[PDB]
């Protein structure tokens, strides 16, 4: 049931609103152990592990329960932003039945936005169908900038899970990250939601991105609006 996973997500969101939101903009959440990430991780795991599913997460690697279901957890996407008081951050969950994704969510606390990625139903924001529109996020340690000089404007918001959700919403045309920094724990839910809304998510090369069940893989995203745009970038 989706009904089951939706309910678990709402419970986590609710918990995050009361327990982690107090720490928005607080410098003490940046104490090394990063503290507010650990607090967020603990909150989610204390609910999720009870269900006896496998979990993958940057702080705990893979927890194997020989379970049919796998939950990829990003407890706080946009960690630096959250601590600094910059309003770009999200919680995310991607739920797999074996190797097929069945449910993904991104919740954006500052806007109260509930993004849903439901295979064989498409992408939703607060219940209402969303789809990419007919301007890009750009991350690069050096590469591109044949890109900069070739698009109307760029954004670099510091929460890549969230930027992908903006694409699925039609706030952006594309998300382009050509460092090899991003983990599947970052991009999983955002890929599912964007793909389900019409995004084309490929890699540095040009072949489709595949979501590994680890917290170690280091990736490139080229998630985009259209064939024309994709070609342009490649």
UniProtKB/Swiss-Prot annotation:
Enzyme type, top EC level: hydrolase
Residues reported to bind Mg(2+) 2: 74, 77, 186
A Pfam family per the record = Inositol_P
Give the binding site residues for substrate. Answer: 77-79, 155, 160, 179
GO MF, any single term = metal ion binding
Fetch the SUPFAM superfamilies from UniProt.
Carbohydrate phosphatase
> Per the record's keyword annotation, is Iron-sulfur included, yes or no?
no
GO biological processes: inositol metabolic process; signal transduction
Activity control note: Inhibited by Li(+), ADP, ATP and glucose-6-phosphate.
- Summarize the thermal behavior of the activity: Optimum temperature is approximately 100 degrees Celsius.
Q: Which UniProt keywords apply?
A: Carbohydrate metabolism, Hydrolase, Magnesium, Metal-binding
Entry annotated with the keyword Transmembrane: no
Per UniProt, Mg(2+) 1 binds at: 58, 74, 76
Stored CDD domains: Arch_FBPase_1
Q: NCBIfam families from the entry?
A: PRK12676.1
Q: How does it assemble?
A: Homodimer.
Annotated function: Catalyzes the conversion of D-fructose 1,6-bisphosphate to D-fructose 6-phosphate. In vitro, also has weak activity with inositol-1-phosphate, glucose-1-phosphate and glycerol-2-phosphate.
- This chain belongs to the protein called Fructose-1,6-bisphosphatase
Q: Which organism is it from?
A: Pyrococcus furiosus (strain ATCC 43587 / DSM 3638 / JCM 8422 / Vc1)
Q: Which gene underlies this protein?
A: fbpA
């Amino acid at each position: 049931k989706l009904k089951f996973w939706r309910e678990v997500a709402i419970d986590i969101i609710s918990d995050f609103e009361t327990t982690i939101m107090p720490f928005f903009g607080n410098p003490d959440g940046g104490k090394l152990v990063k503290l507010v990430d650990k607090l967020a991780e603990d909150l989610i795991l204390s609910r999720i592990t009870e269900l006896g599913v496998n979990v993958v997460s940057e702080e705990v690697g893979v927890i194997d329960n020989e379970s049919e279901y796998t939950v990829i957890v990003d407890p706080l996407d946009g960690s630096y932003n959250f601590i600094a008081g910059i309003p770009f951050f999200a919680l995310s969950l991607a739920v797999f039945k074996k190797d097929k994704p069945i449910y993904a969510i991104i919740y954006e606390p500052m806007t109260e936005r509930f993004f849903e990625g439901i295979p064989g139903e498409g992408a939703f924001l607060n219940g209402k169908r969303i789809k990419v529109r007919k301007s890009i996020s750009f991350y690069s340690r050096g590469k591109g900038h044949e890109i900069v000089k070739h698009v109307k404007r760029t954004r670099t918001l510091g929460a890549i899970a969230l930027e992908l959700a903006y694409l699925a919403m039609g706030a952006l045309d594309g998300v382009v990250d050509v460092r090899k920094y991003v983990r599947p724990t970052d991009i999983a839910a955002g890929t599912i939601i964007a793909k389900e809304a019409g995004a084309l998510i490929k890699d540095s090369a040009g072949k489709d991105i595949d979501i590994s069940f680890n917290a170690t893989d280091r990736l490139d995203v080229i998630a985009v609006n259209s064939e024309e745009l994709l070609k342009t970038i490649l």
